[PDB]
Design a protein around this ligand. Structure first.
Ligand SMILES: O=C(C[C@H]1Sc2ccccc2NC1=O)NO
Ligand code: NI
Length: 166
């Protein structure tokens, strides 16, 4: 199923997601719907908060051909260096806008996989950017939160206008 993706400034995007206590079949079915939603948008990552399911679940596929689905349940990360990098980010919940965001350039991810087993993973580049961006969603944070207040308000106003016209 293709789930509806919430869009800024919907307050539901600010909800803090709750950890997943057991990765059962319902969780894997939600994950499958999230990937379908994500691939159809299309986008390279998606957090459950974005589809209004407030659980700590993230899916991603950084390939150009759907050949590398990745699952992160109860993800966390820790910067591995103090160095920062800029990347122009977009978001399915803030469609049509792309702005630079500075974030730690390398982080160590820790999460549960699709079977519920814990693993860790060093991330740099697009992977490090995407994992931080998706974990932010789970804590009710959007990339526009890093922008100047005036730029974020300009974004909000445009989206609000679009939502009224739709
Ligand atoms: O909205 C999304 C999908 C985004 S994640 C992202 C972050 C930095 C640069 C590009 C993207 N692209 C996505 O599709 N995830 O929450
Ligand atoms: Ni996003």
């Amino acid at each position: 199923a293709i789930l509806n993706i919430l869009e800024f400034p919907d307050p539901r995007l600010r909800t803090i997601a709750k950890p997943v206590e057991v990765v059962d079949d319902a969780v894997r079915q939600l994950i499958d719907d999230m990937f379908e939603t994500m691939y159809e948008a299309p986008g390279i990552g998606l957090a459950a908060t974005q589809v209004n399911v407030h659980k700590r679940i993230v899916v991603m596929d950084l390939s150009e051909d759907k050949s590398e689905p990745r699952v992160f349940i109860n993800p966390e990360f820790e910067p591995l260096t103090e160095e920062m990098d800029q990347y122009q980010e977009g978001c399915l919940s803030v469609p049509g806008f792309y702005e630079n965001v500075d974030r730690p350039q390398k982080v160590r991810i820790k999460a549960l996989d699709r079977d519920g087993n814990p693993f860790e993973e060093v991330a740099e580049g697009l992977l490090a950017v995407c994992i931080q961006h998706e974990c932010d969603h789970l804590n009710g944070k959007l990339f526009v939160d890093y922008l100047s207040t005036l730029k974020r308000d300009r974004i909000r106003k445009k989206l609000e206008k679009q939502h009224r016209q739709q």
